[PDB]
Amino acid sequence: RFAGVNESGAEFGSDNIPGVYGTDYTWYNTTAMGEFISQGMNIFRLNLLMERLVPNTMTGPMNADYLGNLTKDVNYVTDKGAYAMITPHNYGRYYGNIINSTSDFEAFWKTVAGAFKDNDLVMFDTNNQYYGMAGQLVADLNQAAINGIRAAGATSQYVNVEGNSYTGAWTWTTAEGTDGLTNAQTMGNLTDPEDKILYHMHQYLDSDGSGTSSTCVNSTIGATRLMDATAWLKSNNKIAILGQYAGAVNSVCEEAVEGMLDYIDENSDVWTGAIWWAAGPWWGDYMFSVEPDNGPAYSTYDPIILE
Amino acid sequence: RFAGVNESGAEFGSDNIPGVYGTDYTWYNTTAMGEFISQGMNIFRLNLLMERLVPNTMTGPMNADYLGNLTKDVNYVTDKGAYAMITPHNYGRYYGNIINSTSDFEAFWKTVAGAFKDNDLVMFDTNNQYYGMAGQLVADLNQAAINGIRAAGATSQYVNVEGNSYTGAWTWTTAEGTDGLTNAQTMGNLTDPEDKILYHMHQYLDSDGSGTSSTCVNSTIGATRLMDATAWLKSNNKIAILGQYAGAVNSVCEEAVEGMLDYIDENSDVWTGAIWWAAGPWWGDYMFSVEPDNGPAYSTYDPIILE
Amino acid sequence: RFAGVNESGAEFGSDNIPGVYGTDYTWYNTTAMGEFISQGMNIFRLNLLMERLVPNTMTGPMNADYLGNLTKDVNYVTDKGAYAMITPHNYGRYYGNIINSTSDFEAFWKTVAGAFKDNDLVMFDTNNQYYGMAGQLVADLNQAAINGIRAAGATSQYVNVEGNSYTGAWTWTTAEGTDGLTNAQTMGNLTDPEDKILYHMHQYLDSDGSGTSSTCVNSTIGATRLMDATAWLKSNNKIAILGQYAGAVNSVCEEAVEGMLDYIDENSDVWTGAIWWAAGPWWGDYMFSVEPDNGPAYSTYDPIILE
Amino acid sequence: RFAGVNESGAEFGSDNIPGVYGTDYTWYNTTAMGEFISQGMNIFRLNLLMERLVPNTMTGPMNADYLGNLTKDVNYVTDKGAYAMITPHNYGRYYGNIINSTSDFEAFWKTVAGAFKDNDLVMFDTNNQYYGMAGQLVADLNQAAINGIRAAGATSQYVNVEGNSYTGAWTWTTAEGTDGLTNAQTMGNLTDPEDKILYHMHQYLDSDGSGTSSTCVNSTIGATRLMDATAWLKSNNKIAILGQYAGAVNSVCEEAVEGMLDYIDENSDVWTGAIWWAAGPWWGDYMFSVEPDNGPAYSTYDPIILE
Ligand SMILES: OC[C@H]1O[C@@H](O[C@H]2[C@H](O)[C@@H](O)[C@H](O[C@H]3[C@H](O)[C@@H](O)[C@H](O[C@H]4[C@H](O)[C@@H](O)[C@H](O)O[C@@H]4CO)O[C@@H]3CO)O[C@@H]2CO)[C@H](O)[C@@H](O)[C@@H]1O
Ligand SMILES: OC[C@H]1O[C@@H](O[C@H]2[C@H](O)[C@@H](O)[C@H](O[C@H]3[C@H](O)[C@@H](O)[C@H](O[C@H]4[C@H](O)[C@@H](O)[C@H](O)O[C@@H]4CO)O[C@@H]3CO)O[C@@H]2CO)[C@H](O)[C@@H](O)[C@@H]1O
Ligand SMILES: OC[C@H]1O[C@@H](O[C@H]2[C@H](O)[C@@H](O)[C@H](O[C@H]3[C@H](O)[C@@H](O)[C@H](O[C@H]4[C@H](O)[C@@H](O)[C@H](O)O[C@@H]4CO)O[C@@H]3CO)O[C@@H]2CO)[C@H](O)[C@@H](O)[C@@H]1O
Ligand SMILES: OC[C@H]1O[C@@H](O[C@H]2[C@H](O)[C@@H](O)[C@H](O[C@H]3[C@H](O)[C@@H](O)[C@H](O[C@H]4[C@H](O)[C@@H](O)[C@H](O)O[C@@H]4CO)O[C@@H]3CO)O[C@@H]2CO)[C@H](O)[C@@H](O)[C@@H]1O
Ligand SMILES: OC[C@H]1O[C@@H](O[C@H]2[C@H](O)[C@@H](O)[C@H](O[C@H]3[C@H](O)[C@@H](O)[C@H](O[C@H]4[C@H](O)[C@@H](O)[C@H](O)O[C@@H]4CO)O[C@@H]3CO)O[C@@H]2CO)[C@H](O)[C@@H](O)[C@@H]1O
Ligand SMILES: OC[C@H]1O[C@@H](O[C@H]2[C@H](O)[C@@H](O)[C@H](O[C@H]3[C@H](O)[C@@H](O)[C@H](O[C@H]4[C@H](O)[C@@H](O)[C@H](O)O[C@@H]4CO)O[C@@H]3CO)O[C@@H]2CO)[C@H](O)[C@@H](O)[C@@H]1O
Ligand SMILES: *[C@@H]1O[C@H](CO)[C@@H](O)[C@H](O)[C@H]1NC(C)=O
Ligand SMILES: *[C@@H]1O[C@H](CO)[C@@H](O)[C@H](O)[C@H]1NC(C)=O
Ligand SMILES: *[C@@H]1O[C@H](CO)[C@@H](O)[C@H](O)[C@H]1NC(C)=O
Ligand SMILES: *[C@@H]1O[C@H](CO)[C@@H](O)[C@H](O)[C@H]1NC(C)=O
Ligand SMILES: *[C@@H]1O[C@H](CO)[C@@H](O)[C@H](O)[C@H]1NC(C)=O
Ligand SMILES: *[C@@H]1O[C@H](CO)[C@@H](O)[C@H](O)[C@H]1NC(C)=O
Ligand SMILES: *[C@@H]1O[C@H](CO)[C@@H](O)[C@H](O)[C@H]1NC(C)=O
Ligand SMILES: *[C@@H]1O[C@H](CO)[C@@H](O)[C@H](O)[C@H]1NC(C)=O
Ligand SMILES: *[C@@H]1O[C@H](CO)[C@@H](O)[C@H](O)[C@H]1NC(C)=O
Ligand SMILES: *[C@@H]1O[C@H](CO)[C@@H](O)[C@H](O)[C@H]1NC(C)=O
Ligand SMILES: *[C@@H]1O[C@H](CO)[C@@H](O)[C@H](O)[C@H]1NC(C)=O
Ligand SMILES: *[C@@H]1O[C@H](CO)[C@@H](O)[C@H](O)[C@H]1NC(C)=O
């Protein structure tokens, strides 16, 4: 049901907060996004920075200029019938410190979700790639995000919940948090009064699953890396989405990507779709970029994403 | 919609204030302007000096002789259906000092607009090429100019707003004022009770975009230099006009001018036209002069402007 | 709302079709209308002949020279913000024959309106002073004209609809067509998808209301002749304009004219204004000419029109 | 050389004849006129209505109360050495109807001039601003007034004679009466056995010379608008006074008024002075009121009148 791209740029220059628009970060190219929608993609994951959207304190007001831009780009996507996922690209951290106030995190999500409560083509993504924290805390932070989003009256939207350890699909049942707990051990019991939780997992294809290398391990590394997570999803009657994945321009990465997408299809009772990492107007010759006018990966993987 | 020429001559000799009409400065050749109007040009940017139009203090009265000459040239253009844009050619400075009193600047513009409030073919250009100031001040000055012009009851006219750093298109998003701010971040904020703001940018084709050299960088320098500004104008839902541009009599410059005007036409949702620099009766063999009886550039670029 | 003058002269020499410009007919003195607009008049009823605008057959093309002059005068007026009413001074006849083809009449008006569809200060005036026909036919012709005007895409302009029997206000409810039917019986049912129908009546002040004698019956003859139509307009929720009226230069006429305009003022809920008959450059010493440079009625009635 | 103001107020509320003193009209503030006199002004044009001084028929007796008040104000002015102009503010009409009986007009003026025959500081002003009449009849009425004034034995007073078309100076040789004759063609053969005829013209400075707009055409409009009349006065060996003129309180009007007053000085061989319109006690905020305590024009133009 979901096939699309990440939009990355509004979280750029994370070293400069708030940073300057047009120098440190940018918002997304709606012309490109419209082309993607015309070709048939129906989801765009819009990445942003917590500290730019709500400066200083998570319980604070929203910056008007940053929120309007977020809203402009969101409306463009949803006005044309595609889903817009709102993703604070913060790794579970605020101003560089692990978010450990669930009360504060809930307040932040009530604030944000309030701004989009009536848009049923919006999705909320609680935080991009929690890492290096207690497994229990990561679960509690997802739950606090759900609480805040629903408390704001946003009841039609799916909430993407992300695991610890960069929410990696291949390590769902193995990677351990600072408390010794895995994602499989802590993420299952999340509850939602609207029962629209989407488990949100990421999967890269190089040795360490980081996406640093342009070398994919082998032609089947993708599908085989989703198997453990797939079993867990079925076992616990959950559904999921692959929020980030990519491979470089070579024949082994291409096959591995095609195979992993084929697998999501054969297991589409638990997998709902996949979102490429990534699009955006400031990527230059980034090896994973599918931005249309200059993304080096566009010509190869645009057709594959369309299936 | 708009295609025409600058008229420059009444701002000449700006080291002599008030100077002597006929010796330091002159007004414009209406016979040549009528010829241009017959060929089909429909805008004339009439340059002048703030200090000659309102001497001593910019809250003061208008010099009758200078204002009378200005009105005569304006009425000649507008009686024949072409636009006449009134351009204080002052770089954001009055008697050589940066204009830092937005109150005073609003009063100047209420004074001037008052003299043309019922001519709906008049354009108001807040000031030619602000440079070397704060970006916020330049924006605030443009705003104070809009406020003054409307307060005078001049409600039908477009107000041309010019940015800092010589309002260059190619640097709209990168060049910084004395406060590190760029035109992009500061100039969007402007509002107009009559929603008739026209962003007014200039584009030269030599290496430093100063128009000093007869050599244009290459055959595609114009179009490629309008791209950044064009993105900004679409993203921010604004419209603009290229108020100054030129190239010299050689094949590379000529091809460069053609390419940038073709680009303007392709992107005519945001670009409304372009005004050549320049015409006028005292240019002699100035490389960029398209004055009909005299201008080395007339035979080459007059046809190109007409399209 | 509307206060102005007829312009008469392009329909002169009705006995010579096509006739010769400058011999049989003329167009209007823009300098004269410019003065009227300075004074505050905001409507000019521009009279012409259908046969000179659309020669030979009502379905045909327009005559370019006659159309060119009409658009010149129209544009001069509307460019200064006044309304220009376009009026075929044809009495319901075409080449002297009563117009029976509602199909051709609609085609004629679609052609004419097309040339002015985007000028939202034009008004269309279906035909001057129908007379000697069936009441129902006059209504049908007015409806056909409305249909054609709207079908040409002229949706912003008022359509002035004129009744039978010289569209006299004083006989609106009494004078019968050749079918025994009055204007009040037949003109109520006119429809317009833009809801911009302006009922267009005329009122002279001599015994037989023909406006051919300089004697006005008495000092209140004007307002009293309007009361029957005023009641019909209120009872039928229509609005109207007095497209022609005149008194001669004498005290009883002057008083009678003021009293009627005063009446129109007090009944402005249904009377939108009044248009004097007439201005124009070829009237000489016509009893009713308010042409400034030589109209005998100017000094008396110019101030009265302005209120 | 005469320099002073109009007194206007006893002619107010001209729609109520006789009207009620203190409700419809008033007489003048002698204390304010004494002030004007001590500053050096030496002429006061006292406006009234024929019908309130001589009711019912022009051959009738005077109204004691209205005459008594006129006599009070006249005597206050002349007892301090200043001239008092007696001016019926009637536009050549009696009870609203144009005066056709030169016999009655002469009788009216004989009656009025008798009440003042020995006061050699009074002037008589045959009627204010004839308009819309035959030029020959306006001349005949001025002669009849002269004839009646002298027949009364009032042989020392100047008789101010006013032309047709609002006795406008700028139209003296161009505006035609209903008989096709101008003031220049008809006003030149008036005779006086005492040879004290003063030609009495009016000049406002707005576009249509109506004196009803606060905008003056330009800084020289007053002087240029008097030159046709000056050449006529010089060539026909007549002398004149400008019995009404005014500008609003704005820089253009101020210069126009000043320049016209210098023109009169430079042409004092034919122009004897100028009377401002206007002073008086019920003007309130009238744009031309030079009434001391109340008049918005007093501060600016009081000094200008005094020279
Ligand atoms: O491009 C015109 C614009 O550029 C501005 O400078 C840009 C640099 O051109 C650009 O290289 C840089 O982009 C960085 C970005 O800052 C990082 O935040 C981002 O980090 C990526 C990371 O590299 C990926 O591996 C990971 O997967 O994702 C994160 C993002 O979530 O990497 C990119 C690309 O290397 O950003 C600069 C601005 O911050 C100029 O300043 C401006 O003037 C120009 O107009
Ligand atoms: O996914 C995109 C995300 O990646 C981040 O990079 C992460 C990888 O996501 C993550 O998988 C990787 O995990 C490493 C881990 O750090 C090592 O400690 C562990 O080492 C294993 C070893 O492989 C075993 O052989 C040995 O027996 O045990 C040790 C552990 O005891 O290996 C895993 C992967 O195999 O770490 C990466 C970062 O270091 C990026 O940083 C981020 O930017 C991307 O968005
Ligand atoms: O022409 C007869 C007239 O000449 C007067 O002297 C003239 C010079 O002849 C004329 O060259 C000179 O023109 C200068 C002008 O002073 C500068 O202000 C102007 O600056 C230009 C600049 O050169 C351009 O590169 C830039 O794009 O624009 C600015 C203007 O905005 O440059 C011109 C040409 O170099 O002006 C003199 C008067 O000021 C005589 O005095 C007189 O007697 C003669 O009748
Ligand atoms: O446009 C008509 C107007 O031009 C004026 O001439 C201006 C140019 O318009 C302006 O673009 C140019 O700007 C220079 C700037 O001063 C330099 O500091 C800068 O140098 C860059 C360098 O290129 C980079 O490599 C490095 O990073 O440092 C700096 C960036 O910080 O380069 C630009 C060149 O584009 O300056 C000209 C002179 O002021 C005319 O003066 C005026 O008369 C014309 O009307
Ligand atoms: O002779 C000079 C000039 O005249 C042109 O024709 C003029 C007529 O001179 C002028 O009287 C006439 O004014 C008409 C107007 O056209 C009608 O719209 C209006 O209709 C009358 C109708 O004529 C009467 O018979 C009838 O009873 O009623 C209506 C009004 O209720 O009446 C006015 C006058 O009252 O306009 C003509 C031009 O349109 C000649 O064409 C030209 O050649 C001559 O040089
Ligand atoms: O003040 C107390 C008094 O007021 C009476 O009401 C007065 C109004 O106060 C007064 O403003 C109004 O004045 C009119 C006057 O009626 C008109 O006749 C006169 O016409 C002017 C015209 O405005 C000029 O444009 C033209 O040039 O000249 C003529 C004059 O010749 O205009 C003035 C102002 O518009 O008159 C009212 C009375 O008639 C009260 O009724 C009374 O009770 C109060 O005590
Ligand atoms: C925006 O996307 C369109 C469509 O791919 C592309 O043509 C255009 O160049 C992009 N704009 C920028 C500024 O990158
Ligand atoms: C986007 O951000 C810029 C800079 O902060 C701001 O000026 C602009 O108004 C924003 N856009 C919207 C739609 O708010
Ligand atoms: C969370 O971080 C706080 C700092 O805000 C610190 O006291 C401690 O590490 C944690 N406290 C709680 C209550 O979780
Ligand atoms: C691909 O690599 C993974 C991880 O090393 C391994 O489990 C899998 O068997 C490999 N597949 C093939 C076909 O070599
Ligand atoms: C004015 O322009 C005309 C037409 O281009 C030209 O012939 C004439 O020489 C010019 N006059 C001057 C003084 O430059
Ligand atoms: C233009 O200025 C000159 C120099 O003072 C002056 O003589 C001339 O009158 C002015 N022209 C107009 C139309 O005012
Ligand atoms: C404007 O500039 C002058 C110096 O150039 C400075 O003294 C003054 O305080 C400034 N005004 C403001 C409001 O900053
Ligand atoms: C921005 O614009 C608003 C309204 O146009 C104005 O009140 C404000 O002072 C401006 N300032 C900045 C920094 O944008
Ligand atoms: C022209 O020069 C500019 C600046 O050096 C460059 O960006 C552009 O690519 C050049 N165009 C061509 C066709 O080489
Ligand atoms: C045109 O109108 C002007 C303004 O009233 C007038 O002065 C002029 O005489 C008219 N021209 C003709 C040819 O009637
Ligand atoms: C007006 O009509 C005359 C006669 O045909 C023609 O010469 C002239 O070009 C016309 N004017 C316009 C503006 O079409
Ligand atoms: C129009 O009216 C009737 C149709 O009912 C017909 O007899 C008459 O001849 C027609 N006349 C013209 C001029 O069309």
Ligand SMILES: *[C@@H]1O[C@H](CO)[C@@H](O)[C@H](O)[C@H]1NC(C)=O
């Ligand atoms: C004016 O004349 C009309 C028609 O004869 C008449 O109905 C009306 O009563 C007259 N008015 C007066 C006041 O006699």
Ligand SMILES: *[C@@H]1O[C@H](CO)[C@@H](O)[C@H](O)[C@H]1NC(C)=O
């Ligand atoms: C009469 O004039 C005097 C002197 O200007 C002034 O003080 C007083 O208010 C005036 N009275 C009236 C009723 O206008």
Ligand SMILES: *[C@@H]1O[C@H](CO)[C@@H](O)[C@H](O)[C@H]1NC(C)=O
């Ligand atoms: C002025 O008129 C009033 C009202 O009729 C009257 O009472 C008063 O006596 C008159 N004044 C003089 C001096 O006659």
Ligand SMILES: *[C@@H]1O[C@H](CO)[C@@H](O)[C@H](O)[C@H]1NC(C)=O
């Ligand atoms: C006299 O007044 C009558 C109105 O009763 C008018 O018709 C006439 O024109 C006037 N005088 C002359 C000489 O015509």
Ligand SMILES: *[C@@H]1O[C@H](CO)[C@@H](O)[C@H](O)[C@H]1NC(C)=O
């Ligand atoms: C002032 O206006 C008059 C009338 O339009 C005109 O004749 C005269 O030339 C104008 N004066 C100036 C200096 O423009």
